[PDB]
Design a binder for these strands. Structure first.
Ligand SMILES: [Mg+2]
Lengths: 83, 287
DNA sequence: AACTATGAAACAAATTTTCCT
DNA sequence: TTAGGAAAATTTGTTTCATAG
């Protein structure tokens, strides 16, 4: 009910850099937006799309494949460029 | 009347008692979804059904033998929040069953009676699969669910002791794969010929499992307590057409041959890329 | 004039659910 | 029933265009 004053990248970066091992599966990043801001508890079709897009396009977000699927991580020296 | 949270560890035996597991469940078994008919009980490799039996109980009075689908991942044992044991009845069933429910885990109680020497023939246990979106989206549950489709038939019993002490015993089965697809594609290792040797190797180890193909490669690996892999060797595997579901691999040689303490290694099987078995246990001993 | 953060989509490949027989 | 098989859907990732600031 209030568009949080942060960019997706900023938040996607926060959810990750706050989890126990600094890495999250896509669904878990979703679970972070959802329980962190009431704004994300609606219109999922739209922001979920936005997150998947931010996660691929920005190089500071690297997908690390593993046995249990794949997790997302942030590369600080990179997130610290162009912003 | 008792109190043993399904998540609490329990040995398979204590005192003169032992909760055996005569026959074992077969490898594959496609759980059924609420939106579909039943898919029967868990059959055995033989063609029959699993079988569990007590031992140290020599008194004469039935006992309730519990049953719940447990988890089968690396971590300790715990109820598998995505799978529920499902009670089958009537026609093709010869085991009277009682159906409880603890927390969020469905439990199926079967009786073990002195008449059959405390030996029940689990032929009424089925497996129901819950949809993931409904289980992950639970206020507390932080468990995965995607590609999370292997289970273990967990058995538990409470022998009452004449001292006023409830003695709990429990034992899990071998992992079963409930996914239709992850049964046609993912190779699985049911039994391994040997579990160790000197840092030398060369010795052959036979693997018995499923979906083993002409491209089934095996790989040994090692990793620290944090998860960082520090070794990756591709053990040499063979090909035998007469031999149906087995694999013959040549234990590779450990990296540091100059070790004074035994180590822990893991090995799996890979048919393509996504098609990869679980990590199997193995140990290299000092020269 | 060129960017950026956002929206809205097209597509592909891996997986999960639902229907049929 | 129970067993098989597979169509339907969804999930997860990639890319394309467009527009407001
Ligand atoms: Mg990226």
């Amino acid at each position: 009910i209030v568009r949080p004053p942060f960019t997706y990248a900023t938040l996607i970066r926060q959810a990750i850099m706050e989890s126990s091992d600094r890495q999250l599966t896509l669904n878990e990043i979703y679970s972070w937006f959802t329980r962190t801001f009431a704004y994300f508890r609606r219109n999922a079709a739209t922001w979920k799309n936005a997150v998947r897009h931010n996660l691929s396009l920005h190089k500071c977000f690297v997908r690390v494949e593993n046995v249990k699927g794949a997790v997302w991580t942030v590369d600080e020296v990179e997130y610290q460029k162009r912003r | 009347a008792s109190l043993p949270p399904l998540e609490w560890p329990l040995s398979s035996q204590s005192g003169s008692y032992e909760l055996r597991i005569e026959v074992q469940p077969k490898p594959h078994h496609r759980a059924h979804y609420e939106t579909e008919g039943s898919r029967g009980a868990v059959k055995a490799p033989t063609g029959g059904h699993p079988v569990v039996q007590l031992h140290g109980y020599m008194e004469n009075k039935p006992l309730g033998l519990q049953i719940f689908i447990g988890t089968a991942d690396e971590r300790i044992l715990k109820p598998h929040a995505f799978y529920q044991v499902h009670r089958i009845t009537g026609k093709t069933v010869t085991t009277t069953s009682y159906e409880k429910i603890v927390g969020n885990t469905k439990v199926l109680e079967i009786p073990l009676e002195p008449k059959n020497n405390m030996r029940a023939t689990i032929d009424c246990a089925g497996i129901l699969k819950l949809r993931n979106a409904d289980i992950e989206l639970r206020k507390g549950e932080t468990d995965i669910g995607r590609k999370n489709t292997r289970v273990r038939l967990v058995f538990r019993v409470h022998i009452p002791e004449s001292s006023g002490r409830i003695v709990s015993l429990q034992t899990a089965s071998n992992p079963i794969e409930c996914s239709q697809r992850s049964a046609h594609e993912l190779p699985m290792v049911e039994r391994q010929d040997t579990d160790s040797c000197l840092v030398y190797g060369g010795q052959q180890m036979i693997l018995t499992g499923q979906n083993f193909t002409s491209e089934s490669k095996v790989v040994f690996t090692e990793k620290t307590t944090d998860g960082q892999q520090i070794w990756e060797m591709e053990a040499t595997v063979d090909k035998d057409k007469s031999q149906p579901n087995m694999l013959f691999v040549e234990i590779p040689e450990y990296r540091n041959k100059h070790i004074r303490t035994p180590v822990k290694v893991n090995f799996y099987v890979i048919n393509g890329k996504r098609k990869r078995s679980q990590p199997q246990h193995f140990t290299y001993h000092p020269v």
